[PDB]
Design a protein around this ligand. Structure first.
Ligand SMILES: [Mg+2]
Ligand SMILES: [Mg+2]
Ligand SMILES: [Mg+2]
Length: 65
RNA sequence: AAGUGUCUAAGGGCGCAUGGUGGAUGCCUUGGCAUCGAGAGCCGAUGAAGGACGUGGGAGGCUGCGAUAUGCCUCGG
């Protein structure tokens, strides 16, 4: 998973693009799991956690980091 | 001829032998009861107490959490 330390250099738009990419990846993983071709089921939790990480970074950046 | 004379058990009773059922007794316990010594004595429109509905790779309950959903960040151990 992407680390907060290496996340904290993207300014705002790179963070937003990363969040969009992560949401798309999570969507794809959900579909693959639904149709039964996903083997490593830990990927869903990993992607959910990195989405939460990006959201946390954005929010704390807004609220006087 | 006259006379004397057993036994059996369809079922039943008593006593043993050997089983069944049942869960008393004995011995226990992540459960209670009664106090003692320290704290803290309020929470809420910055939305409470308490909930409904969801959330995990696999159905449900409990427990945690809230679409960032058995979790996110920071500092300590
Ligand atoms: Mg008899
Ligand atoms: Mg008989
Ligand atoms: Mg640590």
């Amino acid at each position: 998973g992407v680390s907060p330390g290496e996340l904290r250099e993207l300014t705002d738009e790179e963070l937003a693009e990363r969040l969009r990419e992560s949401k798309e990846e999570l969507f794809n993983l959900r579909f693959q799991m639904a149709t039964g071709q996903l083997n490593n089921n830990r990927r869903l939790r990993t992607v959910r956690q990195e989405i939460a990480r990006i959201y946390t970074v954005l929010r704390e950046r807004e609220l006087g980091l």
